[PDB]
Scaffold this active site. Structure first.
Site, PDB file in Angstrom:
ATOM      1  N   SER A 130       5.472   5.450 -17.864  1.00 20.49           N
ATOM      2  CA  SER A 130       6.655   5.337 -17.001  1.00 20.49           C
ATOM      3  C   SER A 130       7.008   3.865 -16.810  1.00 20.49           C
ATOM      4  CB  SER A 130       6.408   6.144 -15.738  1.00 20.49           C
ATOM      5  OG  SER A 130       7.628   6.689 -15.238  1.00 20.49           O
ATOM      6  N   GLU A 158       9.438  16.779 -18.605  1.00 21.47           N
ATOM      7  CA  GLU A 158       9.461  15.579 -17.765  1.00 21.47           C
ATOM      8  C   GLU A 158      10.147  15.820 -16.426  1.00 21.47           C
ATOM      9  OE1 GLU A 158       7.675  12.504 -20.341  1.00 21.47           O
ATOM     10  OE2 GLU A 158       8.285  12.581 -18.243  1.00 21.47           O
ATOM     11  N   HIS A 197       6.400  14.887 -15.952  1.00 24.16           N
ATOM     12  CA  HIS A 197       6.146  13.457 -15.937  1.00 24.16           C
ATOM     13  C   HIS A 197       4.876  13.194 -15.133  1.00 24.16           C
ATOM     14  CE1 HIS A 197       7.432   9.353 -16.552  1.00 24.16           C
ATOM     15  NE2 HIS A 197       7.450   9.077 -15.259  1.00 24.16           N
TER      16      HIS A 197
END
Length: 566
Positions: free
Chosen positions: A214, A347, A467
């Site tokens: 990320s 995600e 995610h």
């Protein structure tokens, strides 16, 4: 909700206290560093492995007082032997569970781990840069424990860097010498320390791999883009992020005034006076008010964080981003090292928490104008140019008659992760020369082993691979536990650390070392494949066409007459 696990987190921080002490040994050692000798201590894992731990190594000057908001300065090389048997604290930030501010400005440290200090021949060095939106995160082992990687014969280094406005304030007036990107320059200097210190811990300074998830992936990409870090490492892994992600980049120069105003500033919008106030304020008051800097409209336009990496308004001593992400892909030294990139298979499930509150978020999808890339869209987002671009988005993700959460969350997977990945690869293919990029797709779903990010999408129970779901199979955290080595979870730990170390070593993520990879033939993408191939990582490992390719391609079609902008 939150208070539930607030007490949980409390009664799982005090575990990590009772287990950290218990897993400490009496075996101290001293290593050379360029700034002087450092003392670490062997620690143990729940799997009955052990490793040497050096925590709290400074790579820069504490950026306090006059150094606040400024580029880092290297530290003072010390006499004697410096204690590194303990963590130092995290950058000032709003903690996710407590809700209130934690951490300190004195945060420019890195930690070094390895299962053997005298090793026979020199080990690959993996450098992890944590995510958290450039506003949260740490290298503490309650969150990023090296316990799984030290089963492999590598050196693992976990860095910290300044977050939020303390890391990413930016001012136009050259005068004030606050160009922006202080937190990225912190990363630069951490990588410089690693380059010249890893040999002291058994590392091979010719075989460094930087990786992150990320914002840490965006960071790793930034470290591949700047000429400042040229040659300083040899492989990169981008996990769910890159620097041309819409959230990885904001022009924030007029937001310092707004922050000052929220904190009690009385005076003009002139940068010299704005700085003089922000330099005097308590760090926590700024960080807690970060919250409110972005305008009501800036949010509609999907600007995610008020401060973050930025195009600097002038380039001085130590610049890192003199130009916008897409333009740095052009001669960037990092396009020419082996690279792996990937995302999880859902995600956007990492928007449930947000979405839970005022589900009106969903109606956006009725025209999807707000998700049109900002650079193509008009300020109001009603130019027929924008409503028709949004219809393209809207068709790729609304599946039937009316929009839902899955469509919204599926849309988010593409807006924040897959589409930028596509854009980067295609730019990269023509600012290039022979360099393999490999793609993975993390598609392994479990609830028996989790990480703290799951409760900060305070989801619990919910399927799909969100995610941050992969981090559980790379790093120990204080919510983890010892799994049986027959279990699908242990096998996935094995595979993920195995593939990552395999890549770090040879620049090729394949091996018959990896139970389950026995039928995988995994080649990179090239400038010409129409459709991307990826290693889909689930209970089985299988090479497949990216399922997301179809939605990706329609996103590309918003640029049909703005091709220069794609």
């Amino acid at each position: 909700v939150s208070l539930m696990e607030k007490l949980k987190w409390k009664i799982k921080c005090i575990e990590n206290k009772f287990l950290n002490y218990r897993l400490t040994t009496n075996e101290t050692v001293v290593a050379e560093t360029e700034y002087g000798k450092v003392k670490g201590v062997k620690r143990l894992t729940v799997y009955d492995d052990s490793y040497y731990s050096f925590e709290g190594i400074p790579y820069a000057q504490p950026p306090v007082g006059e150094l606040r908001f400024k580029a880092p300065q290297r530290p003072t090389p010390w006499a004697g032997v410096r204690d590194c048997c303990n963590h130092k604290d995290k950058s000032v930030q709003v903690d996710f569970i407590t809700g209130k501010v934690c951490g300190s400005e004195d945060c420019l440290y890195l930690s070094v781990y390895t299962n053997n200090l005298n090793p026979e021949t020199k080990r690959p060095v993996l450098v992890y840069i944590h995510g958290g939106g450039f506003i949260i995160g740490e290298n503490h082992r309650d969150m990023y424990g090296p316990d799984y990687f030290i089963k492999k014969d590598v050196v693992l280094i976990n860095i910290q860097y300044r977050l939020g406005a303390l890391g990413f304030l930016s001012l136009n007036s050259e005068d004030l010498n606050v160009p922006g990107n202080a937190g990225l320059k912190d990363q630069v200097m951490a990588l410089r320390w690693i380059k010249n210190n890893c040999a002291n811990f058994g590392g091979n300074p010719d075989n460094i791999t930087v990786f992150g998830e990320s914002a840490g992936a965006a960071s790793t990409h930034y470290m591949m883009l700047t000429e400042q870090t040229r040659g300083l490492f040899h492989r990169g892994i981008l996990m769910s992020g890159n620097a041309i992600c819409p959230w990885a980049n904001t022009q924030c120069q007029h937001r310092a005034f707004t922050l000052a105003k929220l904190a009690g500033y009385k005076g003009e919008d002139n940068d010299k006076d704005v700085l003089e106030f922000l330099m005097k304020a308590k760090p926590q008051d700024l960080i807690k008010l970060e919250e409110k800097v972005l305008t009501l409209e800036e949010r509609t336009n999907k600007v995610m964080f008020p401060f973050g990496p930025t195009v600097e308004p002038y380039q001085t001593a130590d610049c890192v981003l003199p130009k916008h992400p897409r333009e740095m892909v052009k001669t960037a030294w990092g396009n020419s090292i082996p690279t792996m990139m990937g995302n999880t298979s859902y995600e956007g499930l990492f928007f449930t928490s947000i979405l839970k509150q005022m589900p009106l978020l969903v109606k956006e999808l009725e025209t999807c104008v707000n998700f049109v890339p900002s650079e193509l869209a008009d300020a109001e987002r009603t130019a027929p140019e924008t409503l028709e671009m949004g219809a393209k988005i809207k068709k790729a993700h609304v599946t039937g008659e009316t929009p839902t959460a899955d469509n919204f969350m599926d849309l988010c997977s593409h807006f924040y992760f897959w589409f930028p990945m596509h854009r980067l690869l295609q730019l990269r293919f023509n600012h290039t020369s022979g360099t393999p990029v490999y793609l993975y797709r993390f598609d392994f779903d479990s609830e028996d082993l989790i990480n703290p990010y799951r409760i900060m999408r305070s989801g619990r129970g919910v399927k799909g691979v969100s995610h941050t779901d992969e981090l559980t199979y790379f790093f120990w955290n204080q919510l983890a536990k010892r799994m049986p080595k027959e279990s699908r979870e242990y096998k996935t730990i094995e595979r993920m650390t195995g593939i990552w170390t395999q890549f770090a070593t040879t620049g090729n993520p394949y091996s018959n070392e990896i139970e389950g990879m026995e039928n995988v033939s995994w080649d990179p993408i090239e400038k010409s494949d129409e459709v991307y191939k990826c290693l889909n990582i689930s209970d089985e490992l299988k090479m497949i066409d990216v399922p997301e390719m179809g939605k990706i391609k329609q996103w590309e079609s918003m640029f049909e007459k703005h091709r220069d902008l794609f």
